[PDB]
Write a protein that binds this ligand. Structure first.
Ligand SMILES: [Ca+2]
Ligand SMILES: [Zn+2]
Length: 1057
């Protein structure tokens, strides 16, 4: 029943041009199909396929299918009557009730009857009636979604029907494509006859099934709110122009299946247009028989160049070549394929000559005649889509290409031509209509970039698709714009992907930068469910008319495959973009709070995240959403204030670093604060490196005990723009320490559809193996008991000790996380116990150490006013007392030595007295710079000497050459007594010597032997003598005989008694 083709093509043209809801659409379904097909026409739908697969549907199932289709027709006709009555009078309670009732009956029948059109074992011969019923079902379900509330269905019922509709779109599409593939696969594939049958089944099922199924997604009214116009880009092939009757003639004289399929059918390709056909004429001498012996095809791409074929067949010259530049669509071929039988003598059979002797090609304005016209009419196989006009206007298909097949042997010569055709709905330009959703298959481009493949479509897309296995350029496509070029458009893709990807669209340059979500697992087959839609893009304008679109895939910042079917283009003003942006902002803000009452903030929502959401709200439209924007703005500010209230850090935005000695932040002085950058919309801190590890860059604060709760976990969190050698500590019972290296991220390079830098260089807030790749950090600490007397608190410390270290950070918070349970609780109990036990042990040790140090310091002085040294106090005794003071432990924190520990006060008391002793010692000494704390000043030097530091508080003279001498002239009181005292060490052999003398004699000396640039001694010897000058000047001379001599100090003291 070839009337099924005529019906199908007429319906398809209706779906192309008139895909709109309402009475008009339903009346169309009646006028084209359901009101004019009766039982004998349904029978013909089945016969067409039964005849090809050579199997009749079993009678029980066959009769049932036809009776069911009659029932559907009757019930749909009644539904359309009720719908029309309702449409003309929609507030009438009786028309509303009736349309609901008729809808329910028909929906119920389709649910019950669709299984009867896919009986196991007869899916293929039932497939064209299945597609009819499927199409009808999606149509009436769509009606219930769009109109159901107005009819009087509930919102619940409407949303449930929507869910059913979109599930059925996939189910029905899949059945159509799968069953198509099954039918082809089940056929024999050896002979020419097998091939004829196969290609017939492929063509007929394309026209009566696949072409209809291609429209099923358009019934999703939420995806297609505005009228869509579809295009079928697939190529179909008419029967070979070869005269053959299988009843009479041997298939042995015709090309085999594999030769036909490999020779006659094109591999997947970009959509093309027949430009020029050049035909070569050969002959067969006996009987003077001319025929089409070969040809060359020139084709064009939309907005690109020409494509040339090699010679098909032979470049024969028995008549001149005929070259036809059609300059228009060929809608009809009238062809003359002949069989000529040349007699041979008994008992040889006749020679069989098969060839094309003539073809007339018709365009709407011209005809082109290759030799002569024949009676094989393309219109028989590919009839008009509209019979209300002549074929030159109403044609369904245009000629695309021609291939050539041949077989020769004994005694025969077979040549033939095969024509391919494209459907009328595949337009010869890619035109954008502002009143439509414009559907443009990527196969309608003009350039496939390197590494992109055109592949056979899965069956439900109406044509072929594009694939890439890695990131790269897909296609370039030309578009014509049927509007002023200042109108704004939005675009989306229908795609399938086993990876998350990013797609860029260039016009004219980066117009769209769109994320593509994974739609399927690695390995999964391409079913209807795997094809999804993106959101519509940001608006853009075309730069010219026509314009060129380039599509490229890029890394989200290689896995699986990316397929793209089509791009869809809508006028921006036909959408509600500002409202869509508002609704997303609303969800983001709502997610901040614990509940819908919005009284409390979620613990796991970060301060930094709140700042990010505020940018969403701030980027909303002032033009359309001002009241709603203001209200959302209030909520996000409330969320921020809640973040501020739970933050236990003082001065979280760095307004008062070093303002107070005992509170808020303390920091080293080369830290800087800036008001914000690309990453931060708050004050943030830059920590530089340091030239010396003993003077680290630091920033710290104490959290007071009063702010803490017992048996509770706290977290420090924040955001790091970049860092190297950043150390973070949290300290209570012990120190928790991490080193955080965060590489920088890019902002300028990433190909920008929107700029990251604005006017005046302000940030645009509206623009999108051991390394700590995450910019977020979190560190927790567990509090056991609390005790305000002890006031342990928690120390927060950031430190950098390296030259090249650095950090930029902000959005710091310190917050309560959760109560402790289980092992965490047990652990903090053990940690607090251990901390107490160690503190007790430290106290006992400290009592002993302190008393020893104090007694040793006190002994340096005459009394407890600490204003006068004992005469017998020498420098070595001061250093020895000092060594006892430094035995005190935990005077400062090991993690950062500027922070006092528990024993700071007693260390500082005693150290202070040490420093008093040094100061008094200097004041008493009649020798200038006798302790070498000022280097060599006030000494006369001959030869090479050095002054060096030693722990803790010492400077020493080193004499490494015996020819070196150090001297000073000293004014003294004649007739008074003086003590000379030297603290020194002799390294190696020889003696060290300190000489004192007057202008004339009175020589005395102190000598040092080792026997009882430089690593310094652990201990020194002290010696003294009494000296009695007669004049008012002495010389003090330091030297040695050999080796090295190290002198801590020389003192000359007046005996005040
Ligand atoms: Ca010294
Ligand atoms: Zn000291």
């Amino acid at each position: 029943g070839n009337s099924s083709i005529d019906i199908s093509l007429s319906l398809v043209q209706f779906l192309v041009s008139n895909f709109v809801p309402g009475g008009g659409f339903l009346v169309g379904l009646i006028d084209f199909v359901w009101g004019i097909v009766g039982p004998s026409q349904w029978d013909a739908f089945l016969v067409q396929i039964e005849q090809l697969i050579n199997e009749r549907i079993a009678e029980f199932a066959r009769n049932a299918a036809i009776a069911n289709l009659e029932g559907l027709g009757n019930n749909f006709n009644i539904y359309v009557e009720a719908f029309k009555e309702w449409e003309e009078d929609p507030n009438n309670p009786a028309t509303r009730t009736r349309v609901i009732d008729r809808f329910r009956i028909l929906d119920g029948l389709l649910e019950r009857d669709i299984p009867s059109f896919r009986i196991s074992g007869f899916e293929v011969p039932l497939l064209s009636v299945y597609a009819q019923a499927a199409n009808l079902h999606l149509a009436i379900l769509r009606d219930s979604v769009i109109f159901g509330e107005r009819w009087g269905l509930t919102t619940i019922n409407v949303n449930e029907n929507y869910n059913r509709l979109i599930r059925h779109i996939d189910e029905y599409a899949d059945h159509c494509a799968n069953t198509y593939n099954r039918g082809l696969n089940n056929l024999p594939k050896s002979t020419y006859q097998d091939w004829i049958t196969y290609n017939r089944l492929r063509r007929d099922l394309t026209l009566t099934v696949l072409d209809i199924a291609a429209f099923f997604p358009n019934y999703d009214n939420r995806r297609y709110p505005i009228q869509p116009v579809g295009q079928l880009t697939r190529e179909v092939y008419t029967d070979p122009l070869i005269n053959f009757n299988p009843q009479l003639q041997s298939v042995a004289q015709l090309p085999t299946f594999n030769v036909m399929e490999s020779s006659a059918i094109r591999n997947p390709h970009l959509f093309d247009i027949l430009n020029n056909l050049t035909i070569f004429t050969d002959w067969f001498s006996v009987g003077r028989n001319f025929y089409w012996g070969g040809h060359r095809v020139i084709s064009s791409l939309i907005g690109g160049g020409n494509i040339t074929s090699p010679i098909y067949g032979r470049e024969a010259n028995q008549e001149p070549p005929r070259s036809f530049t059609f300059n228009g669509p060929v809608f009809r071929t009238l062809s003359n394929p002949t069989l000529r039988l040349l007699q041979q003598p008994w008992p040889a059979p006749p020679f069989n000559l098969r060839g094309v002797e003539g073809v007339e090609f018709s365009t709407p304005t011209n005809s082109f005649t290759y030799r002569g016209r024949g009676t094989v009419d393309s219109l028989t196989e590919l009839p008009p889509e509209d019979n209300s006009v002549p074929p030159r206007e109403g044609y369904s298909h245009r000629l695309c290409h021609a291939t050539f097949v041949q077989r020769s042997g004994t005694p025969f010569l077979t040549t033939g031509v095969v024509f391919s055709w494209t459907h009328r709905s595949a337009t010869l330009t890619n035109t954008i209509d502002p009143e439509r959703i414009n559907q443009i298959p990527l196969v309608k481009g003009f350039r496939v970039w390197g590494g992109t493949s055109v592949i056979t479509g899965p069956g439900f897309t109406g044509g072929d698709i594009l694939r890439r296995n890695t990131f790269g350029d897909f296609v370039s496509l030309q578009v014509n714009i049927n509007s002023p070029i200042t109108q704004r458009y939005r675009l989306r893709f229908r795609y399938a992907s086993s990876r998350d990807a990013r797609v860029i669209v260039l016009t004219g340059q980066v117009s769209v930068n769109m994320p593509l979500q994974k739609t399927m697992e690695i390995g999964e087959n391409l079913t209807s469910r795997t094809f999804r839609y993106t959101d519509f893009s940001n608006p853009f304008s075309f730069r010219a008319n026509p314009d060129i679109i380039g599509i490229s895939e890029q890394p989200l910042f290689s896995s699986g495959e990316l397929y793209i079917d089509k791009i869809e283009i809508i006028l921006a003003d036909a959408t509600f973009e500002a409202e869509s942006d508002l609704e997303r902002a609303q969800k983001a803000v709502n997610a901040l709070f614990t509940s819908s009452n919005q009284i409390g903030l979620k613990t796991d929502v970060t301060d930094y995240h709140i700042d990010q959401v505020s940018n969403l709200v701030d980027c909303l439209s002032d033009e359309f959403c001002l009241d709603e924007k203001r209200e959302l703005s209030e909520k996000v500010k409330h969320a921020k204030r809640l973040s501020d209230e739970r933050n236990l850090l003082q001065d979280p935005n760095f307004r008062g670093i070093n303002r107070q000695p005992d509170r808020g932040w303390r920091g080293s002085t080369d830290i800087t604060i800036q008001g914000g950058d690309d990453v931060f919309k708050e004050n943030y801190v830059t920590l530089p490196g340091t030239v010396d590890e003993c003077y680290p860059t630091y920033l710290y604060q104490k959290i007071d005990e009063s702010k803490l709760k017992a048996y509770t976990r706290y977290e420090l969190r924040g955001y790091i723009e970049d860092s190297q050698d950043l150390e973070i500590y949290l300290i209570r019972y012990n120190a928790k320490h991490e080193i955080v290296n965060v590489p920088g991220t890019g902002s300028l390079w990433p190909l920008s559809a929107q700029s990251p830098i604005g006017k005046c260089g302000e940030p645009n807030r509206c623009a999108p193996k051991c390394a700590h790749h995450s910019h977020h950090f979190t560190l927790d600490i567990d509090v056991g008991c609390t005790d305000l007397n002890e006031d342990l608190g928690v120390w927060v410390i950031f430190k950098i000790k390296t030259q090249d270290g650095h950090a930029r950070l902000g959005n710091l918070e310190f917050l309560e996380e959760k109560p402790l349970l289980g092992e965490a609780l047990a652990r903090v109990k053990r940690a607090e116990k251990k901390w107490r036990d160690k503190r007790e042990k430290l106290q006992l040790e400290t009592n002993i150490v302190y008393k020893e140090a104090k007694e040793s310091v006190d002994a340096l002085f005459v009394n407890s006013q600490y204003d006068r040294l004992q005469v017998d106090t020498n420098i070595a005794m001061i250093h020895a007392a000092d060594k006892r003071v430094h035995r005190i432990r935990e005077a400062y924190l090991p993690e950062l030595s500027v922070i006092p520990g528990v024993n700071a006060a007693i260390f500082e008391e005693l150290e202070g007295r040490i420093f008093t002793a040094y100061s008094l010692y200097d004041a008493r000494n009649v020798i200038k710079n006798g302790d070498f704390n000022n280097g060599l000043l006030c000494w006369n030097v001959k030869g090479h000497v050095d002054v060096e530091e030693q722990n803790n508080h010492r400077s020493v003279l080193v004499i490494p050459e015996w020819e070196a001498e150090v001297s000073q002239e000293v004014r003294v009181c004649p007739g008074r007594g003086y003590i000379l005292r030297v603290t020194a060490y002799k390294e190696g052999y020889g003696e060290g010597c300190v000489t004192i003398h007057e202008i004339e004699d009175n020589t005395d000396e102190l000598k040092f032997s080792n026997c009882v640039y430089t690593p310094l001694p652990a201990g020194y010897v002290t010696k003294d003598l009494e000296y009695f000058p007669e004049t008012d000047k002495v010389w003090i001379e330091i030297g040695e005989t050999e080796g090295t001599f190290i002198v801590d100090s020389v003192e000359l003291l007046l005996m005040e008694e």
